[PDB]
Amino acid sequence: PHRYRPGTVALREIRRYQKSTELLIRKLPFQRLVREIAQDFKTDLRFQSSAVMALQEACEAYLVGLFEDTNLCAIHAKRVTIMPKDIQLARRIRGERA
Amino acid sequence: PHRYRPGTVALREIRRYQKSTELLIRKLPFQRLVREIAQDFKTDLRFQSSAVMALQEACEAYLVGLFEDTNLCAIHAKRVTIMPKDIQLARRIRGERA
Amino acid sequence: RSRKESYSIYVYKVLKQVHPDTGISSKAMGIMNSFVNDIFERIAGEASRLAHYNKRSTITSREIQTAVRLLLPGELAKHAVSEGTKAVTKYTSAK
Amino acid sequence: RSRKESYSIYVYKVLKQVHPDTGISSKAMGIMNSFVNDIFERIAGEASRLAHYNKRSTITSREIQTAVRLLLPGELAKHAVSEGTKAVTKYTSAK
Amino acid sequence: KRHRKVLRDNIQGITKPAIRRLARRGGVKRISGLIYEETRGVLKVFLENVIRDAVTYTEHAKRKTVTAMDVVYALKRQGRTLYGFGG
Amino acid sequence: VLRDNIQGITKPAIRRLARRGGVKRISGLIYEETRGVLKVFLENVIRDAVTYTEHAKRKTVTAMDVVYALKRQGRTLYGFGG
Amino acid sequence: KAKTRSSRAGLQFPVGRVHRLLRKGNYSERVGAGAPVYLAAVLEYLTAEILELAGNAARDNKKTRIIPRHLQLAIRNDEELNKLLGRVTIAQGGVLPNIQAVLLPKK
Amino acid sequence: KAKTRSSRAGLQFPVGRVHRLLRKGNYSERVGAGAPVYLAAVLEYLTAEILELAGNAARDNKKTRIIPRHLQLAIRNDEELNKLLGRVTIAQGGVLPNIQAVLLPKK
DNA sequence: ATCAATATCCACCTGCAGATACTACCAAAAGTGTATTTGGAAACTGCTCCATCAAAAGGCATGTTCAGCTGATTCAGCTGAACATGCCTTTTGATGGAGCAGTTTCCAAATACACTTTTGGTAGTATCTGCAGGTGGATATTGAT
DNA sequence: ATCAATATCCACCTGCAGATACTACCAAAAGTGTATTTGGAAACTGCTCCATCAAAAGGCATGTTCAGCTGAATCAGCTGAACATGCCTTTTGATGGAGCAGTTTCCAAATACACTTTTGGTAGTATCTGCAGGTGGATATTGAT
Ligand SMILES: [Cl-]
Ligand SMILES: [Cl-]
Ligand SMILES: [Mn+2]
Ligand SMILES: [Mn+2]
Ligand SMILES: [Mn+2]
Ligand SMILES: [Mn+2]
Ligand SMILES: [Mn+2]
């Protein structure tokens, strides 16, 4: 009953996802989240389907980029594990919460 | 013979310099450096007095801000001493390079 | 010798309404001028984009209002909007 | 059904000049269209500002040129400036 | 008539595996258990900000439908220029 | 006693900037690192300033040339016009 | 006979000048009559808000003349103004007193 | 003998179109005759630069059709295009393969 | 704990750099009265957004198990901080001219007009053909022993 | 260093989606010359204000000493990775309905335009005075003992 060691499959996944371009969040749940948030600003809105897809492409690219910065913050602290404090430092230095 | 401990004067200077607004680089050497760099783009240039001063205000405000972010990166790695790698992380996450 | 316009007369007048016994240095006044010109440009630029996106040739107070909502943080925007609307009302209700 | 214009035609001509046997997906073409629109606005914006800063009411090829030098990095600026200068010189002399 | 079903708690549709996948694309090898909730909060802030601006353009235009272009202009305003959806 | 102009940005002056930035303790390698960063900053801003100078057919860099440079570099400065 | 548009709108800021700056800035082909009024009032409002807080900072430091320092203290201590002006440098402003906790001595 | 201004200037990109976009964009009162020529040329040059590199990435991946991924690989592997487009997201572009060295196994 | 050395605070002074106040003249705002432009009001499209639902794969949730990472401990050796001086660089102030910027001039060049020609974007169709995704099947890679 | 389990790779094969490619066009653009106005390059000066430059004056380059920081080596507890198992949702593909973007025509309002009347705002300068430090002395902080 064989087993890959901790880290091996994580590396395999890094290679797989850095090679591909498909969106990583499921479509319908993301769509519901957009509609919920927008509905809290303004009732009775409709969305072009491409508007939702534009939002998803932007959200994902933003989060991927943030994780890259976060990873660099963890490594700077001599860790390999990302923590909330890494995300917070990344955001602070980016001026999203300076 | 009297002696303040490592860190006591450093804290004093932080308090002193954070209270004040005077420029902290001497004027003439800054002016020279500005003229030198400018000479590579166009020869025989003059500068208004206010041009050099705008440059020095901008440059010092930038460096002070960068030292704040640098300090946060040192502290993130459980140090109190800023190092080149801290400046380098801060610049990377700012998008100023890499 | 040509005329170099600025907002300093008006900044000074607003200073006296708000703090009648308070003055302002020349440097502080230059910062206030920079401030007014910056926000002018931000608001006018957003309004211009808004008109262009809606294929309109005209910037009205409605483009200024929406620009203010896009550019100012919450509470600032609310009061700016109410001040803007008040001034336009006063200006219309004035033979 | 009203006409929605794009740079597609011209992007595709340039593609065939550089890579005769290479095609392009419509999504890729959407990207190229965004890119051209984006660079147009950036250059036109810098040119507008530059003309205003010098109290000129005309955007000439000299404003476009300086805008290009302000916006593009090193080598791309050099080569863009040559291709722009050469298109104008040719255009002027080709009348 | 019918009236839309109540939307609530849809931030949880941003699941732990979807967040791990995004982290993997970002080069991340190991992920603290607290990351998932922190990421949902960051995502919500980002989406709220961009949707707020998009809806502002929708309302300014007097439409009830958020277009791709409303989103593209909102993202541009936000210094997050996106190519591939018009403009 | 000739010395490089960049070195006229001295250890004590860099130390003062750091202090205003809230820094308590500084590695010896910071001084040269900071000089490199300062030079890149000055290069980028001066290049744009001089590009505006040249465009206005001038031989004098104005405060406004610097102000416009700083603005397009995302370093907007208040107090020197514009 | 001739009344200023500012005085009609109840403003210190110059409605006429704002109108002209809108015309000659190539923002649009046309400019509605309300637009300069609205814009002038917004700019006045924001100016009043900063001078109010800067005046208070001058008062706190036993001073009657507003300097750049007082503008910086006003702006950076106010969450909304700090955000509006997050990418702006106030010449001769300095910074807020702020020392990270871990740098403080113990005993 | 109606000649296009593009043909006169030696360009694939549309000079007339660019002239009109500059006019309708409220950039300035007037637009010089050289301006749209110089600008169409620059835009053409940059699109050739991108398509050359993207076609290469397509060929490298044994493909005949350029897709957004090839555009992303071209832009992000070129120092200058990466800087020009540093604040732009290419939809369906993905990222460059890149694993920080410390994360690889062993010693 | 003491005791002292040095930093820090506060009240008071006062000359002057740098404010506020005053004045006249003129650019540019506002008043008047045509002359263009525009952006909803109404009145219709067709599109596309919504919702619905059925089938089924595919990814999600959960529990178990343990590898190896984080963070605590301790510590030695290294490195920056503190500190006392005289030389060197900076700063301060005043001289000559480089060039800004003010001003008028006039023509090459731009706008506006209103015609003619051409294109590019379409809807309609056909029509091909690059490649997604699936199958073997050969070949690394990993981890245990 | 061997071998076994399993992920990887690669090259073929289909049947479409999506791309290319015609029409066959035709509405909107673009562009062809006239009539027309005018922006700004050019050439001249004068007066700021900038580079220089030499005297006055106050930071910094320096070497030594040791406080306490960093980074190393070790270890334990616990997190978070991996994977097996069960099954809930999202994905996919339609149906039908209608909400609403997107056009087109009147034009009554709303701007722009050309002219003229006036005045607010600038820029010279004339005064006025907030406060930058300078003093004196009292107290708090720091660090040794
Ligand atoms: Cl209006
Ligand atoms: Cl031109
Ligand atoms: Mn080729
Ligand atoms: Mn006391
Ligand atoms: Mn189970
Ligand atoms: Mn409608
Ligand atoms: Mn005092």
Author numbering:
A (entry chain E), B (entry chain A): 38 to 135
C (entry chain H), D (entry chain D): 28 to 122
E (entry chain F): 16 to 102
F (entry chain B): 21 to 102
G (entry chain G), H (entry chain C): 13 to 119
The authors write:
DSB recognition by and activation of PARP1 is proceeded by actual phosphorylation of H2A.X13, which ultimately culminates in γH2A.X foci formation to induce a cascade repair response. Here, we produced γH2A.X using a hybrid chemical approach and assembled nucleosomes with either H2A, H2A.X, γH2A.X or mutants of H2A or H2A.X as the incorporated H2A variant. Nucleosome stability/dynamics investigations and crystallographic structure characterization were carried out in combination with surface plasmon resonance (SPR)- and bio-layer interferometry (BLI)-based techniques to measure the kinetics of PARP1 association with and dissociation from the DSB constructs (represented by the blunt-end DNA termini; Homo sapiens histone and PARP proteins). Additionally, enzymatic assays were performed to shed light on the catalytic parameters of PARylation. This reveals that PARP1 recognition of and activation by DSBs is modulated by histone variant composition and post-translational modification status.
In order to shed light on the basis for the variant-specific differences in PARP1 nucleosome association, we sought to obtain well-diffracting crystals with NCP, which required screening of different DNA constructs. The structures of H2A.X-NCP, γH2A.X-NCP, H2A.X-S139E-NCP and H2A-NCP were solved at 2.85, 2.75, 2.2 and 1.99 Å resolution, respectively. By ‘locking in’ the entry/exit points of the nucleosome core, this (type of) construct may generally facilitate structural characterization of nucleosomal systems having diminished stability (elevated dynamics). Accordingly, the X variant structures were compared to respective H2A-containing NCPs, which shows that substitution with the H2A.X variant causes no gross conformational alterations within the histone octamer. The substitution of Gly (H2A.X) in place of Arg (H2A) at residue 99 within the docking domain eliminates a hydrogen bond between the Arg side chain and residue G94 of H4. Nonetheless, by maintaining that hydrogen bonding position, the H2A-R99 guanidinium group is situated in immediate proximity with another guanidinium group, that of H4-R95, only 4.3 Å distant. In the H2A-NCP structures, the H2A L1-H2A′ L1 contact is stabilized by side chain hydrogen bonding between H2A N38 and H2B′ H79. Notably, H2A N38 can in principle hydrogen bond with H2B H79 in any protonation state. Although it is not conserved among the common H2A subtypes, the H2A.1 subtype we employ here has Ser at position 40, which is an Ala residue in H2A.X (and other H2A subtypes).
